């Protein structure tokens, strides 16, 4: 039969703001040189375990370590039309 579960508006909310903060640092890199690298984003996390990149026309970057599935996901859209994702332990 059917089941209930407990959603977050605290731990799952905070990962959004730090993902918009990285959409802001990635814009500074798209203006700065035009591509992000893992060694640029490991200095910008500041709250998260892992940062993740979806910029059109360049390959995916993943910072820190790959997550298992028991993780929170923060997500943003940047100012040159890119996408940023952030991952934290659940």
Q: Assign residue 8 the CATH number of its domain.
A: 3.30.450.250
Q: Report d(CA 30, CA 79) in Å as an integer.
A: 9
CA distance from start to end of the chain: 26
Look up the domain containing 7 and give its range: 1-90
Sign of CA dihedral 72, 88, 11, 83: negative
Neighbours of 85 (CB within 10 A): 19
Strand runs labelled E in 13-78: 50-54, 71-77
> Are 41 and 55 a contacting pair, CB within 8 Å?
no
Order of strands across the sheet with 50-54? 50-54, 83-89, 71-77
Residues in the chain: 90
DSSP 3-state helix, strand, coil percentages of the chain (rounded to 5)?
Answer: 30, 20, 50
As a dihedral over the C-alpha atoms of residue 45, residue 50, residue 56, residue 57, rounded to 10 degrees, the angle is 100
Q: How was this structure determined?
A: NMR
The total of structural domains in the chain comes to 1
């Amino acid at each position: 039969g059917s089941e209930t579960r407990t959603i977050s508006s605290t731990a799952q909310e905070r990962v959004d703001l730090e993902a918009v903060r990285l959409a802001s640092i990635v814009d500074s890199r798209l203006i700065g040189t035009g591509s992000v690298d893992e060694d640029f984003l490991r200095e910008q996390i500041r709250d998260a375990r892992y940062a993740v990149i979806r910029i059109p026309g360049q390959p995916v970057v993943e910072v820190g370590t790959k997550p298992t599935g028991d993780v929170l996901q923060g997500r943003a859209t940047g100012e040159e039309g890119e996408t940023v994702l952030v991952e934290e332990p659940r």
